[PDB]
Amino acid sequence: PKANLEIIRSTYEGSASSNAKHLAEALSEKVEWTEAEGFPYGGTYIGVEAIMENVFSRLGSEWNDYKASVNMYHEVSGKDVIIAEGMYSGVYKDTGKSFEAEFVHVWQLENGKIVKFKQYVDSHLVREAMKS
Amino acid sequence: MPKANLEIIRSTYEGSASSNAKHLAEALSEKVEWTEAEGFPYGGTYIGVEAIMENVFSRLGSEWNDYKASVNMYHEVSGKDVIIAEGMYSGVYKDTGKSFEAEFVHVWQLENGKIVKFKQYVDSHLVREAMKS
Ligand code: NA
Numbered sequence: 001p002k003a004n005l006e007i008i009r010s011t012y013e014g015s016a017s018s019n020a021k022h023l024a025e026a027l028s029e030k031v032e033w034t035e036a037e038g039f040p041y042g043g044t045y046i047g048v049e050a051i052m053e054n055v056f057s058r059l060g061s062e063w064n065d066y067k068a069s070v071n072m073y074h075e076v077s078g079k080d081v082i083i084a085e086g087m088y089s090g091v092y093k094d095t096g097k098s099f100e101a102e103f104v105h106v107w108q109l110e111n112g113k114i115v116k117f118k119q120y121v122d123s124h125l126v127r128e129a130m131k132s
Numbered sequence: 133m134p135k136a137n138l139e140i141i142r143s144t145y146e147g148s149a150s151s152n153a154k155h156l157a158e159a160l161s162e163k164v165e166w167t168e169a170e171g172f173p174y175g176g177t178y179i180g181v182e183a184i185m186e187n188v189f190s191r192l193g194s195e196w197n198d199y200k201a202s203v204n205m206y207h208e209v210s211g212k213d214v215i216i217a218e219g220m221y222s223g224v225y226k227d228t229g230k231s232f233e234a235e236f237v238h239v240w241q242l243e244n245g246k247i248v249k250f251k252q253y254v255d256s257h258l259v260r261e262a263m264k265s
């Protein structure tokens with residue numbers, strides 16, 4: 001099997017299509033996916049179909065060029081956990097305002113499947129781009 | 133020999149505010165660079181303890197009641213002098229009387245037992261909402 005670090009990098013480091021396919025291939029059936037409360041898509045979603053409807057489809061439809069760029073990956077001692085420090089950027093369609101916001105994503109894997117994801121994000125900056 | 137990284141970082145959260153502060157001051161390197169998230173009210177990068185206290189901790193103390201950072205997971209990065217803490221802030225903003233809760237991650241880097249870098253990630257919208265009249 002591919003290393004966990006490689007699996008996680010594969011959800012960010014390629015084209016949008018390769019990233020999306022890689023993520024879907026790696027998600028466990030009952031993956032628990034948490035967007036930060038202050039982020040517009042905040043909440044916890046169980047399974048790929050809820051994640052697509054409530055999160056990724058909206059990142060595509062409400063923003064132009066929504067992008068997540070990782071600056072560091074960290075492998076956690078004594079866990080199957082990968083922590084990514086990164087930056088988001090994008091333009092909110094309704095306002096035309098661009099933003100940048102720093103994030104951390106905490107990924108947990110079991111037997112090489114992604115079983116948990118949690119977003120931490122500088123949500124004030126995201127929300128400011130949404131303000132007319 | 134210095135104490136373990138994990139021990140040092142835990143000692144900055146797991147006591148009362150007064151001992152946490154003592155422990156942090158004792159562990160900060162002279163060259164520490166400390167970054168608060170841009171969208172957090174005290175956003176910026178601060179060099180050295182004096183700047184950190186002036187711009188960050190003094191204001192957490194003076195502008196809020198019972199500002200607290202509660203850690204839910206401590207992580208140590210394999211083969212690196214990096215500790216990552218996941219947790220929750222809580223507090224009441226004095227000027228509005230509003231309470232908040234917000235999720236954070238803190239990324240700490242050390243060199244030979246002294247903290248050389250800190251970086252805050254925080255759900256800043258929720259903090260900012262408590263500050264609105
Ligand atoms: Na590990």
Ligand code: NA
Pocket residue numbers: 192193194195196197198199
């Ligand atoms: Na106070």
